[PDB]
């Protein structure tokens, strides 16, 4: 239902240019704006500092890229885009990171460099939302 | 010529704005760098580090487009990304910016790495000229 996600801002605008697997279309590209700030007591290290972050995430400008776009708004305002604490691969804490919705974070170099083409992945991050009770 | 991880720069155009360039586009850049091994030119030699994805913002206007040829340039002699310590992270063995500061939000000013900024494209181009980019 709702987060602990950090203060910050989701915007979006879109390009003329194309994500491989969606050359009819352009793209849209969502900019999120995190601030600084120190854990609640939602969160699992109450009164830590942690830095802001920022991201851009990409999805193809067709409908259904456009419905994604709606239910990423919904998540953002469910405050479940982002949370704070352990980031897992690199072992620190008391950092802003994501929340079990993926996003891809490049254009191209397909999923190992977190970008397109990837014919699933819009299936899959509307599975991770729908388990956050998004749909 | 710098120690950049491998990986790749692209950039495209949206018709909206930034804050103090009205009636320009954006052009966003993608910057997206593969994990490795450290080699002899990095702070650990033999640690890896993982990769990372990174977004530029500048406005797509005439100074903004040079600035965009120089960061090609940069990222063309390996000197956009090093590996190294993070403050944001509190570790090293990261890939990092490498002194060219660039900006990661569209909105929010200097506080949020964002615009507006109206001395951000001359500080750029100063840190471009240091490492001899011009």
Same mark, same amino acid.
């Given at each position: 239902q709702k987060g602990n996600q950090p203060e910050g801002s989701? @915007?979006?605008? @879109?390009?003329?240019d194309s994500l491989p697997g969606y050359e009819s279309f352009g793209t849209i590209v969502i900019t999120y704006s995190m601030k600084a700030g120190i854990q609640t007591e939602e969160h699992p290290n109450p009164g830590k500092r942690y830095p802001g972050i920022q991201r851009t995430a990409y999805l193809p400008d067709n409908k259904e890229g456009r419905k994604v776009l709606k239910l990423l708004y919904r998540a953002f305002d469910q405050k479940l885009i982002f949370t704070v604490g352990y980031s897992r691969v690199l072992g620190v804490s008391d950092v802003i990171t994501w929340n079990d919705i993926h996003h891809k974070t490049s254009r191209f170099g397909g999923p190992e460099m977190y970008g397109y083409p990837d014919p699933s992945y819009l299936k899959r991050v509307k599975e991770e939302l729908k388990?956050?009770?998004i749909e």
């Open positions: 989701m @915007v979006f605008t @879109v390009s003329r388990a956050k009770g």
